[PDB]
Amino acid sequence: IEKKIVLRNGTEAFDSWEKPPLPVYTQFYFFNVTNPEEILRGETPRVEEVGPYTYRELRNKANIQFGDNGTTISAVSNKAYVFERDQSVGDPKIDLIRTLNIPVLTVIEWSQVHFLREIIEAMLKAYQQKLFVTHTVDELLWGYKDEILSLIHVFRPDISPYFGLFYEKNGTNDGDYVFLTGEDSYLNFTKIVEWNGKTSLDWWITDKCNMINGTDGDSFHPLITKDEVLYVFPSDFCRSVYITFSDYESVQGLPAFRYKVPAEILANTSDNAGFCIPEGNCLGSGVLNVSICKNGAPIIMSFPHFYQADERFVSAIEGMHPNQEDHETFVDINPLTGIILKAAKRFQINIYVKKLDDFVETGDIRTMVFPVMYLNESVHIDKETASRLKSM
Ligand SMILES: *[C@@H]1O[C@H](CO)[C@@H](O[C@@H]2O[C@H](CO)[C@@H](O[C@@H]3O[C@H](CO[C@H]4O[C@H](CO[C@H]5O[C@H](CO)[C@@H](O)[C@H](O)[C@@H]5O[C@H]5O[C@H](CO)[C@@H](O)[C@H](O)[C@@H]5O)[C@@H](O)[C@H](O[C@H]5O[C@H](CO)[C@@H](O)[C@H](O)[C@@H]5O[C@H]5O[C@H](CO)[C@@H](O)[C@H](O)[C@@H]5O)[C@@H]4O)[C@@H](O)[C@H](O[C@H]4O[C@H](CO)[C@@H](O)[C@H](O)[C@@H]4O[C@H]4O[C@H](CO)[C@@H](O)[C@H](O)[C@@H]4O[C@H]4O[C@H](CO)[C@@H](O)[C@H](O)[C@@H]4O)[C@@H]3O)[C@H](O)[C@H]2NC(C)=O)[C@H](O)[C@H]1NC(C)=O
Ligand SMILES: *[C@@H]1O[C@H](CO)[C@@H](O[C@@H]2O[C@H](CO)[C@@H](O[C@@H]3O[C@H](CO[C@H]4O[C@H](CO)[C@@H](O)[C@H](O)[C@@H]4O)[C@@H](O)[C@H](O[C@H]4O[C@H](CO)[C@@H](O)[C@H](O)[C@@H]4O)[C@@H]3O)[C@H](O)[C@H]2NC(C)=O)[C@H](O)[C@H]1NC(C)=O
Ligand SMILES: *[C@@H]1O[C@H](CO)[C@@H](O[C@@H]2O[C@H](CO)[C@@H](O[C@@H]3O[C@H](CO)[C@@H](O)[C@H](O[C@H]4O[C@H](CO)[C@@H](O)[C@H](O)[C@@H]4O)[C@@H]3O)[C@H](O)[C@H]2NC(C)=O)[C@H](O)[C@H]1NC(C)=O
Ligand SMILES: *[C@@H]1O[C@H](CO)[C@@H](O[C@@H]2O[C@H](CO)[C@@H](O[C@@H]3O[C@H](CO)[C@@H](O)[C@H](O)[C@@H]3O)[C@H](O)[C@H]2NC(C)=O)[C@H](O)[C@H]1NC(C)=O
Ligand SMILES: *[C@@H]1O[C@H](CO)[C@@H](O[C@@H]2O[C@H](CO)[C@@H](O)[C@H](O)[C@H]2NC(C)=O)[C@H](O)[C@H]1NC(C)=O
Ligand SMILES: *[C@@H]1O[C@H](CO)[C@@H](O[C@@H]2O[C@H](CO)[C@@H](O)[C@H](O)[C@H]2NC(C)=O)[C@H](O)[C@H]1NC(C)=O
Ligand SMILES: *[C@@H]1O[C@H](CO)[C@@H](O)[C@H](O)[C@H]1NC(C)=O
Ligand SMILES: *[C@@H]1O[C@H](CO)[C@@H](O)[C@H](O)[C@H]1NC(C)=O
Ligand code: NA
Ligand code: NA
């Protein structure tokens, strides 16, 4: 019986959960817009993939507190990103990327939703902004000071003058989780019970879609069987998902089940209609409008190169060539212990753009989901730790 895989102060499983020994790497890839003026004149966008920009992660748990006679545990998961120049295609503090002006699109979308409408319209009218802007990779990723945000900031101090895809996400966590250890049962090991105090979400339509299912995805319950389905809640993705068995794999000298994210997760279906806000009206198979949880910005999640998506999402942006092996999302789990031996968590950030008559910033741009940057967050078990695990 494997009941030593339980988060108790004394077991080695707890120490690995507290301080993950395996290094995790996130790699950023950007889409450099080659014809901005022609896009504003209503022509088909043309982009170039640029990457990787590889960062090593520093993971740990903090504010660790037990409870309920040892059945529950609460903590926060801090995550930092240390840059690796030699594992990267270039220096991000020099390498420039030309892409959409996300701050102006954000505040344009705010104004259309009547949030600081007069102030935004006034500033935009006085200070002309460009729809396409060029910044360094370090700026786009970890923040830069924007004009319009700075002007709004003087009127509304709560509004940040700086914008970045991962702004202030270095050396920080993503809410206060409370997990469930495997004391009551091994099946509900590292299972999330609440997040930021609440037992479920409240920005999707159906109660079904707002449920917090499964684990964070850093580990799974022991003794996994081929037939079952594993639920994951990635906070950044703003919904629970699930992964199904694909095929058999061996990592080092260890057995592993290859579990992937299936097409059903972002499919245009009734099960996923609840995610399509407001009136159950969806953009199409293979995307997720996450504007509600990204503070009103017109941000659309997808898989890299619109993998597992409607063909028209690929035809809209010249430069998207999706294949399985490069863009799928998979995880190799040791069935016995439920430990991730290898994985590639991959997702893409897009921006919803459309022509506006009230705005000449938009020109005559087409209505489309415009890709900005996607990543590969990956892990791989090394020989020393694998051989350590192999013994048990
Ligand atoms: C992704 O995802 C995301 C999320 O999820 C999303 O998002 C979304 O989006 C959408 C888009 O569309 C949106 O929707 C929109 O919204 C907007 C906004 O809203 C808001 O606001 C408003 C306004 O307010 C203001 O005003 C008023 C009056 O007017 C007042 O009352 C107030 O107070 C304010 O005022 C202020 O300010 C101003 C400035 O100027 C000044 O002046 C003054 O003094 C003051 O200060 C409002 O209205 C709203 O409200 C609502 O809601 C709430 C909640 O809480 C409630 O409570 C209320 O009651 C309401 O509700 C109700 O009503 C409404 C009506 O409006 C309705 O809607 C409902 O159902 C109910 O019944 C808010 O707050 C808006 O604006 C819009 O609306 C529009 O559109 C629609 C369509 O859908 C319709 O339905 C409506 O009706 C409208 O329409 C109209 O208008 C327009 C413009 O102008 C036009 O064009 C048309 O034609 C029409 O017109 C007509 O009618 C009218 C009546 O209405 C009249 O007046 C005239 O004459 C004509 O006849 C819409 O709705 C949303 O919101 C969002 N959400 C979020 C969360 O974000 C997105 O989308 C996605 N994406 C993708 C791509 O997919
Ligand atoms: C994180 O995620 C990214 C992907 O999103 C990974 O990066 C990719 O890594 C794979 C390998 O793991 C790379 O694949 C290799 O690409 C090489 C270049 O291919 C070019 O040329 C061919 C024609 O020759 C074109 O078809 C293609 O479009 C490219 O323009 C290939 O030479 C390699 O081929 C070898 O493997 C294939 C397997 O299918 C064999 O069939 C071949 O015979 C050959 O042996 C290979 O396909 C891919 O290019 C990478 N892309 C990017 C953007 O980096 C990361 O590796 C991943 N994980 C980690 C941990 O980093
Ligand atoms: C993504 O696309 C964007 C836009 O196409 C691209 O930005 C551009 O990069 C080029 C270089 O690739 C920049 O051109 C340089 O401008 C600087 C500043 O004035 C000059 O110092 C440079 O002059 C030297 O260039 C060569 C040596 O580096 C020599 O041939 C020459 O004699 C000079 O010594 C050079 O002209 C250009 O400024 C930007 N454009 C914008 C709008 O920012 C970006 O590089 C692409 N990103 C990636 C990762 O490829
Ligand atoms: C969070 O977890 C719950 C429970 O695991 C998920 O809800 C379940 O979703 C399944 C989808 O297969 C529902 O199955 C249904 O079966 C009937 C026939 O019996 C079929 O006609 C339907 O089309 C559907 O497939 C099931 O009812 C439902 N169970 C419960 C208790 O809600 C939910 O999807 C998960 N949410 C997220 C966001 O991951
Ligand atoms: C995120 O924060 C971490 C932790 O401070 C940074 O990692 C350090 O970077 C310094 C640069 O001065 C280096 O000396 C070390 O590689 C790191 N220190 C430690 C203790 O790990 C990381 O660079 C930050 N990332 C970004 C993008 O700013
Ligand atoms: C996603 O699926 C829905 C439901 O099938 C589509 O809505 C249907 O569209 C067809 C024609 O394309 C109509 O005949 C039906 O009457 C529609 N049914 C409902 C309930 O709306 C919707 O068009 C699809 N969305 C996309 C972007 O392809
Ligand atoms: C766990 O180990 C021992 C318990 O006696 C103690 O030294 C340490 O402070 C404990 N830490 C946590 C986070 O429980
Ligand atoms: C998890 O543990 C067991 C096994 O599934 C189950 O009986 C219990 O209700 C679950 N607890 C929670 C909080 O989900
Ligand atoms: Na409304
Ligand atoms: Na316009």
Author numbering: 37 to 428
Original authors' sentences:
Lysosomal integral membrane protein 2 (LIMP-2) is encoded by gene SCARB2, and is also known as scavenger receptor class B member 2 (SCARB2; refs 1, 2). It has N- and C-terminal transmembrane helices (being a type III membrane protein) and a heavily glycosylated 400 residue luminal domain (bearing nine potential N-linked glycosylation sites). LIMP-2 binds to β-GCase in a pH-dependent manner, and dissociation occurs in acidic late endosomal/lysosomal compartments.
Human LIMP-2 luminal domain containing residues 28–431 was produced by stable expression in HEK293S (GnTI−) cells and crystallized in two space groups, C2221 and C2, at pH 6.5. X-ray diffraction data were collected at the Diamond Light Source, and structures of both crystal forms were determined using the molecular replacement method based on the model of LIMP-2 at lower pH9 and refined at 2.8 Å resolution. The most surprising observation is that we can identify from the well-defined electron density that the sugar attached to N325 is P-Man9GlcNAc2, the first time this sugar, which bears a terminal M6P, has been seen in a protein structure. In the C2221 crystal, the sugars are also stabilized by interaction with residues from a symmetry-related molecule that pack directly at the origin of the three arms of the glycan, forming a network of hydrogen bonds, although this destabilizes the distal phosphate group. In contrast, at pH 6.5, the helical bundle is very well defined and similar in both space groups. At higher pH, the α4–α5 linker (residues 151–152) folds towards α7, such that α5 tilts about 20° towards α4 and α7, making the bundle more compact and further stabilized by the C-terminal cap of α4 formed by His150 and Arg153. At lower pH, H150 and R153 move away, decapping the α4 C terminus and triggering a cascade of structural change in the helical bundle that leads to the dissociation of β-GCase from LIMP-2.
